[PDB]
């Protein structure tokens with residue numbers, strides 16, 4: 001099944017719950033990415049329409065797959081005795097937003113606006129299709145350098161979206177909201193908005209605002225870089241301590257800092273080429 005259909009490049013990276021290889025489909029030469037998940041390391045098992053037990057990442061990616069390219073395409077998946085293999089789209093040339101920010105330091109605001117807008121569009125699409133990612137960060141965002149288009153990746157910490165409380169959490173501590181640190185309780189939308197504020201701060205400052213649990217709970221945001229007041233306001237709003245004080249996605253995208261956003265293609269010519 002697999003060996004025939006795909007040629008395997010080197011490793012692209014690995015985290016908890018996954019290892020990802022660069023790869024090529026032999027039939028069309030289409031660039032792919034090949035993700036392997038060990039069954040013994042899966043803490044959160046999903047179920048398909050078929051009534052078949054597979055990793056949650058597969059459930060979530062199937063639920064969001066259609067014309068929309070702000071989320072990574074799941075092309076195919078396989079089961080093996082001890083593992084699962086996911087075939088995912090791979091743009092070329094591409095670069096991880098974590099590496100991209102590392103290289104450039106603070107992003108100019110025009111570029112941050114485009115990037116953050118596209119992530120917001122992506123996350124809205126996820127919620128629309130019933131999916132909550134739970135690990136929004138620079139590491140889980142890819143830049144298609146030719147098209148200036150961003151893509152959410154790694155739904156291995158994700159869950160079905162629900163409007164009731166979540167008591168489990170598998171994503172990145174430093175990106176997690178204060179309600180999780182203190183009460184091991186949160187709600188999806190409000191918690192995602194927090195992690196997006198961490199993301200925006202990362203984009204405009206070159207680094208994340210908080211390292212320890214104590215700083216997260218204090219919720220005081222210091223800017224080490226020149227950032228506009230409109231941008232500051234938005235970040236501080238997303239990073240409100242009390243979830244109900246956080247903006248909704250509509251209110252984020254209607255904020256004054258998010259006006260006159262560049263199209264992706266414009267974003268590439270000015271900022272990436």
Ligand SMILES: CC(C)(C)Nc1nnc(-c2ccc3[nH]cc(-c4nccc(C5CC5)n4)c3c2)o1
Nearest residue numbers: 012013014015020033088089090094096153154
């Ligand atoms: C832990 C991590 C980020 C490796 N998990 C992950 N899960 N899926 C991917 C994933 C899926 C499709 C992809 N297509 C292209 C990449 C890729 N390209 C360049 C650099 C990177 C590194 C962060 C992994 N990924 C890709 C990754 O990564």
